[PDB]
């Protein structure tokens, strides 16, 4: 169903504002089918916080 875990695993395992936009797009491509999952909204809020923190 929802594809938040795949994008999350990719973005995390990458870094183990460069790819933050790519991860935001990966989460946005499944914005409709993930309305309700706590993981998706948490990832969106964390992306917003990282965008507002790195000044970009």
């Amino acid at each position: 169903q929802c594809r938040i875990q795949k994008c999350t695993t990719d973005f995390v395992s990458l870094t183990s504002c460069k790819a933050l936009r790519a991860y935001a797009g990966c989460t946005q491509r499944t914005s409709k089918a993930c309305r309700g999952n706590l993981v998706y909204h948490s990832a969106v809020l964390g992306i917003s916080d990282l965008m507002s923190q790195r000044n970009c």
């Binding site: 999350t8 695993t9 995390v12 395992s13 183990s16 706590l38 993981v39 948490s42 964390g46």
Partner: protein, 105 residues
């Protein structure tokens, strides 16, 4: 500064002075969990909803809530042949003895 992962941890019952009541085995690999639980949490960590919320709130305001900790999420039992309290040789399956997966809680 790595992420929450499973590292090796060997236990030797003979070195712990337990060889007097434990027959076999005298040593085994138990593993342990160690690493940072940074945002976001991977799918392999399969965290709880509370762990997700706490990780998010710690990423937002680190001075508001501590981060989630790397802990064993699934453990496997091992058998132990030991002399009990009545000098009876007992083959008992002890649960939660070997870490098989780590995660954030």
């Amino acid at each position: 500064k790595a992420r929450c992962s499973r590292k090796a941890l060997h236990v030797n019952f003979k070195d712990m002075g337990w060889d007097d009541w434990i027959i076999a085995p005298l040593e085994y690999e138990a593993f342990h969990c160690e690493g940072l639980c940074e945002f976001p949490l991977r799918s392999h960590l399969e965290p709880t909803n509370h762990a997700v919320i706490q990780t998010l709130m710690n990423s937002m305001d680190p001075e508001s809530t501590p981060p989630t900790c790397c802990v064993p999420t699934r453990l496997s039992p091992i058998s132990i042949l030991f002399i009990d309290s009545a000098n009876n040789v007992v083959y008992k399956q002890y649960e939660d003895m070997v870490v098989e997966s780590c995660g954030c809680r």
